[PDB]
């Protein structure tokens, strides 16, 4: 169900347990079911929620992603308000073990904890993806500069500052595709990255010919320009495809 192996491993068993509890609650089964003392299990949840918000706050302050800074605090409120209902429900159940409003608080609280934790993981994941897209867009912009290269000196400068960006993007895509649960999207990412990687020496070779045809002042210039532009076009189309699949 979840798009990442990490998100799936964290949320799927707790989501299924809550879905089962919600079903029992709406069927009327929870209402008169004897509930043991929940002071300690709820205290363990409040301690875990406090640590998630504290670690979440450390990310908000040290990050530069303004969407993550904006979207994490409403989710902190959500998990904390959910925790409030669980702490209060445990108290209410000690005074009245048959409390129907307290059982409602247990379900709303558990759902709120899940929903808020899910929001936080999805926000954190979207920010990690935005880091990869930034790297992709930087390469796209750098590829728009290939047509400016017209001398040997330009070619050396250009190639030198292209090689690391490509290596960085390939490493990021390789690590990301291994995290995805959707196998068809993993195939799209790796195949697009294979195309970009293999077209890089094709682009460098076309730029070398372009520089040589320009210097010799021969009839082969238009074909050299067309071969370079077509390679920039294909690489750019593939990087735009990677950005699209990364967001899915």
């Amino acid at each position: 169900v979840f798009h990442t192996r990490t998100i799936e491993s964290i949320l799927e068993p707790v989501a299924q347990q809550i879905s089962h509890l919600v079903i029992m609650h709406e069927e009327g089964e929870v209402d008169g079911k004897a509930i043991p003392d929940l002071t300690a299990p709820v205290a363990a949840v409040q301690a875990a929620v406090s640590n998630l918000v504290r670690v979440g706050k450390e990310t908000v302050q040290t990050t530069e992603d303004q969407i993550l800074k904006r979207d994490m605090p409403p989710a902190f409120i959500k998990v904390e308000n959910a925790c409030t209902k669980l702490v209060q429900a445990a108290q209410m159940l000690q005074s009245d073990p048959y409390s129907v409003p307290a059982r409602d608080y247990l379900i709303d609280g558990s759902r709120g904890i899940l929903s808020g934790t899910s929001d936080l993981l999805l926000t954190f994941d979207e920010a990690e993806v935005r880091k990869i897209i930034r790297v992709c867009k930087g390469i796209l912009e750098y590829l728009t500069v290939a047509e400016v290269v017209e001398t040997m000196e330009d070619l050396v400068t250009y190639t030198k500052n292209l090689g690391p960006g490509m290596t960085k993007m390939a490493k990021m895509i390789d690590e990301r595709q291994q995290e995805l649960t959707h196998q068809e999207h993993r195939v799209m990412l790796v195949n697009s990255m294979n195309t970009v990687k293999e077209l890089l020496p094709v682009l460098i070779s076309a730029m070398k010919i372009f520089v040589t045809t320009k210097n010799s002042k021969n009839q082969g210039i238009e074909e050299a320009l067309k071969n370079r532009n077509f390679t920039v076009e294909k690489m750019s189309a593939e990087i735009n495809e990677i950005i699209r699949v990364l967001q899915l």
């Binding site: 707790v14 809550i18 299990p41 363990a44 929620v49 670690v55 979440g56």
Partner: peptide, 27 residues
């Protein structure tokens, strides 16, 4: 790292909530 610390914190919330839901659901 900050990523590992955040993920471990979320895992702890899921685990403690799972244990609470299992205790409520208990027949």
């Amino acid at each position: 790292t900050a990523k590992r610390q955040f993920v471990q914190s979320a895992k702890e919330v899921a685990n403690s909530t799972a244990n609470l839901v299992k205790t409520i659901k208990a027949l």
